[PDB]
C-alpha cells in the first residue's frame, strides 16, 4: 500500500521516514498498539523524545504538537497519527 | 452509560472529572474529534496544559504521559484516552 498523507506539519524527509517506519511496523505486527509502539519508539530514538502514536481504523483526536512534528496518514487499513509533545 | 475505566494513572477525583467531562461531551457531540477537543480543552484549562485526547471505536496507542495524568476508559460506544505530556 501507498500511504495517503491526510495532514502534515513535518519536513518531507521526516514524512517519508514516518511512512517507511510504519511500513516496517505493518509487516511485523497486526495489533494496532504494537504498530504504534514500534513507530513511537523508533521516532524517540531517531528524532529525540517525546513522540506519541495512535493507530486505528476508527478514531478522532485532538492533540497539541511541537511545530513541524505532526503527521496523520492512511496506510493499508489503518489511520496513523504520530506527533511530538513533551 | 457508566464509564468502564480500563487503565488509569490518575487521582480518583481527576478520574471522576474526566468521566464527567466526557459525559457532557457525548451529550453535545457525535463526532469523535469534537468529543476529544472538548475534553482536551477543558483539561488544559482546569489542570494546565498540555493534554491530548483520542476518542474512537477502534484504535491502539502508545504514548508517554506525566505520572498521575493518564486515563483510558470506555463510555457509551467509544474508548477515550486522555493524558498529559508537554
Amino acid at each position: 500500500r501507498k500511504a495517503v498523507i491526510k495532514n502534515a506539519d513535518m519536513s518531507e524527509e521526516m514524512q517519508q521516514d514516518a511512512v517507511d517506519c510504519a511500513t516496517q511496523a505493518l509487516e511485523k505486527y497486526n495489533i494496532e498498539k504494537d504498530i504504534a509502539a514500534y513507530i513511537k519508539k523508533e521516532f524517540d530514538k531517531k528524532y529525540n523524545p517525546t513522540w506519541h502514536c495512535i493507530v486505528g481504523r476508527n478514531f478522532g483526536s485532538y492533540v497539541t504538537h511541537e511545530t513541524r512534528h505532526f503527521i496523520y496518514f492512511y496506510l493499508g487499513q489503518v489511520a496513523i497519527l504520530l506527533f511530538k509533545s513533551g | 452509560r457508566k464509564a468502564v475505566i480500563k487503565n488509569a494513572d490518575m487521582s480518583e477525583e481527576m478520574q471522576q472529572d474526566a468521566v464527567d467531562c466526557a459525559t457532557q461531551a457525548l451529550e453535545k457531540y457525535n463526532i469523535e474529534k469534537d468529543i476529544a477537543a472538548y475534553i482536551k480543552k477543558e483539561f488544559d484549562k482546569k489542570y494546565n496544559p498540555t493534554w491530548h485526547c483520542i476518542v474512537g471505536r477502534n484504535f491502539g496507542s502508545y504514548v508517554t504521559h506525566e505520572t498521575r495524568h493518564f486515563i483510558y476508559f470506555y463510555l457509551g460506544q467509544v474508548a477515550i484516552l486522555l493524558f498529559k505530556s508537554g
Binding site: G60, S61, T64, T67, A79 | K33, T50, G86
Partner: peptide, 12 residues
C-alpha cells in the same frame, strides 16, 4: 517549543 493544536477524524 512553539506548538499547534490539531484534530483528526476518520470519516466515511
Amino acid at each position: 517549543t512553539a506548538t499547534r493544536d490539531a484534530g483528526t477524524q476518520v470519516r466515511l
